[PDB]
Amino acid sequence: FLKSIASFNGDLSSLSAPPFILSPISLTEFSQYWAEHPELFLEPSFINDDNYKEHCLIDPEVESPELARMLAVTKWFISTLKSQYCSEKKPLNPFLGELFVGKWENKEHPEFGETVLLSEQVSHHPPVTAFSIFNDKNKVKLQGYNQIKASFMLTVKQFGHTMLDIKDESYLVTPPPLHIVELEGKSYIQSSTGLLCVIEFSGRGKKNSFKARIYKDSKDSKDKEKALYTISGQWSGSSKIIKANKKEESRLFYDAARIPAEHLNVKPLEEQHPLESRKAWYDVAGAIKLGDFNLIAKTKTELEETQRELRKEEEAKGISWQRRWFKDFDYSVTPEEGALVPEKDDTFLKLASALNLSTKNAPSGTLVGDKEDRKEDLSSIHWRFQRELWDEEKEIVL
Ligand SMILES: CCCCC/C=C\C/C=C\C/C=C\C/C=C\CCCC(=O)O[C@H](COC(=O)CCCCCCCCCCCCCCCC)COP(=O)(O)O[C@H]1[C@H](O)[C@@H](O)[C@H](OP(=O)(O)O)[C@@H](O)[C@H]1O
């Protein structure tokens, strides 16, 4: 049916979607699926030199807190997969400058504190969503950006990465490659402790299967037999964990059949800013819920039209659209003059270097030296969160 778009050569985001496939939900809302389970997102921050063994229920004989926290982070990463990768309508392609904010109050857990979700569409050509999720009370901070490049056989490339900070401890996370939805290739979790987790996805075997191995260092990752732990199963189901070679003492690691302890708190439409997602797409979302294809086309075209004419006003003024909470930094070796450049002790560079991960705009998970890494004129612009920009915020509230 719609497959008649296969003849097109290039990024599908250049095309336009027929109303009958549209979801009333914008892609900027999918940012929440990085911390959908508040307790798992915060767990690592509760593990310390004095309680790691009692917190590592999967292995009360864990060697160190660094390792106990890696296990919690691994469990957390697994939990984000289902809600993110589990007819089905296509989410709306966000407009440039589109915001989505919310918060998990965690009322039944005063020790959790408030966790804030900030999400912004920092690019429309091509579509790129930046995001941040932070819990000041426990010093857990997450930031990253996402980009989906669909091309035509239907290919789907994943770009970007996510960085998690548990106090003074850092974790680099790279999204998994995929295909129409099943995951493939590898995801990486590189900690500032030297610890590395390599998640290998496979389909066909059972659906949504994966193997996750934890290594003491990136040198050990070369040989799977060196793995300290081995986790296996379905990320949409259950998975087992084996320490070293103790195949006899296999354990349940994570059970994806999990109920969210809390839903994301979003303020009512009346209080929302014209830039906030649900407020801006209000009419379209309504038409979609209604089933009126012509109303969907009308309301949507008028939003895209306003956006288009808005760009024309900027182009004819020499000025451009100012991103709100995220700034684009240049990680290339020959930065353009006047470009934003990374700090001295930049976390990304440090962790990427340990993983030997490419810092270019190659598909997520690309290692230094791969075919994609050595591609001509490849840039290295990465969106970064600026906590100050949110602190200085005057209009948007939670
Ligand atoms: C972290 C989140 C989870 C990861 C993502 C999950 C799955 C990804 C896997 C496969 C998805 C790939 C392909 C899906 C298969 C077929 C549909 C793609 C064909 C397609 O309509 O062209 C694209 C969307 O296309 C993607 O932007 C590429 C697709 C990106 C969207 C990803 C979600 C897709 C979910 C699968 C739903 C399949 C539904 C199809 C099956 C129906 C039963 C059209 O956008 P739209 O009309 O909404 O958006 C328009 C903009 O609003 C306008 O401003 C723009 O005007 P401009 O300003 O003048 O340029 C205009 O050109 C449009 O961009």
Side-chain angles (χ1 to χ4, degrees), residues 242-245 249-262 264-269:
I242 292 174
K243 178 176 184 173
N245 283 3
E249 308 173 19
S250 182
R251 282 179 163 91
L252 174 61
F253 179 72
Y254 178 67
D255 185 13
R258 188 185 188 95
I259 299 181
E262 248 192 4
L264 177 78
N265 184 319
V266 183
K267 55 191 177 301
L269 293 165

Side-chain angles (χ1 to χ4, degrees), residues 27-60 62-86 90-106 108-152 154-179 181-203 205-215 217-218 220-224 226-245 249-262 264-269 271-305:
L27 266 174
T28 59
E29 292 197 42
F30 283 62
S31 291
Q32 68 177 285
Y33 298 133
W34 268 106
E36 179 193 20
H37 299 276
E39 66 284 345
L40 302 178
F41 178 73
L42 301 180
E43 175 60 13
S45 75
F46 295 113
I47 301 177
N48 63 39
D49 296 342
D50 290 88
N51 67 11
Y52 60 99
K53 291 184 182 301
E54 291 72 59
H55 273 253
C56 194
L57 301 164
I58 210 62
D59 182 353
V62 59
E63 199 72 49
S64 62
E66 291 76 18
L67 191 52
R69 288 193 288 271
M70 171 62 68
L71 285 168
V73 171
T74 298
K75 183 176 179 180
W76 161 77
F77 174 71
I78 300 300
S79 70
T80 70
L81 296 183
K82 206 184 78 171
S83 50
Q84 198 160 182
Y85 304 106
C86 264
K90 186 190 75 64
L92 301 171
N93 184 20
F95 62 84
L96 183 56
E98 176 176 337
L99 307 173
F100 180 72
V101 302
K103 61 178 182 175
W104 294 269
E105 302 183 79
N106 302 327
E108 262 286 54
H109 302 257
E111 74 277 22
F112 283 13
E114 181 176 86
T115 292
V116 179
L117 169 61
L118 300 178
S119 175
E120 178 178 6
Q121 196 70 181
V122 297
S123 183
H124 176 76
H125 292 153
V128 180
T129 308
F131 52 85
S132 179
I133 302 179
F134 49 94
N135 180 282
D136 293 342
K137 180 180 178 61
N138 290 280
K139 296 175 177 298
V140 181
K141 314 182 314 176
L142 177 152
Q143 69 159 105
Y145 71 95
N146 197 266
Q147 175 179 353
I148 295 299
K149 196 177 193 304
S151 181
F152 253 136
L154 182 67
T155 303
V156 174
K157 299 292 185 58
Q158 174 77 226
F159 292 88
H161 55 264
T162 293
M163 281 175 295
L164 175 65
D165 268 82
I166 312 297
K167 302 190 193 305
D168 289 330
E169 203 170 81
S170 299
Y171 292 83
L172 173 54
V173 183
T174 60
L178 62 94
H179 57 260
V181 57
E182 185 61 276
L183 306 177
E184 70 175 9
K186 305 176 184 180
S187 283
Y188 302 104
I189 304 185
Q190 177 64 63
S191 181
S192 61
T193 58
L195 294 182
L196 170 64
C197 185
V198 175
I199 305 83
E200 216 169 13
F201 298 98
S202 65
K206 302 189 64 178
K207 187 193 199 307
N208 309 135
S209 299
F210 81 91
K211 295 182 178 298
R213 297 178 177 86
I214 295 179
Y215 303 97
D217 36 78
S218 298
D220 286 22
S221 68
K222 304 301 177 178
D223 188 332
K224 295 181 177 58
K226 303 182 183 299
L228 302 170
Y229 298 92
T230 303
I231 306 171
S232 184
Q234 292 66 46
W235 48 264
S236 63
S238 61
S239 55
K240 295 293 220 62
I241 182 174
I242 292 174
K243 178 176 184 173
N245 283 3
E249 308 173 19
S250 182
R251 282 179 163 91
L252 174 61
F253 179 72
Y254 178 67
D255 185 13
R258 188 185 188 95
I259 299 181
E262 248 192 4
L264 177 78
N265 184 319
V266 183
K267 55 191 177 301
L269 293 165
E271 308 179 12
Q272 293 180 24
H273 186 280
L275 279 174
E276 303 194 50
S277 186
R278 300 178 182 181
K279 184 64 159 300
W281 288 100
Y282 181 77
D283 291 332
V284 180
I288 297 178
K289 294 172 177 296
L290 222 55
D292 184 342
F293 297 166
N294 277 270
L295 186 57
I296 297 179
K298 174 182 176 62
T299 58
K300 188 184 181 187
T301 298
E302 198 251 338
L303 189 160
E304 300 167 340
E305 227 65 60

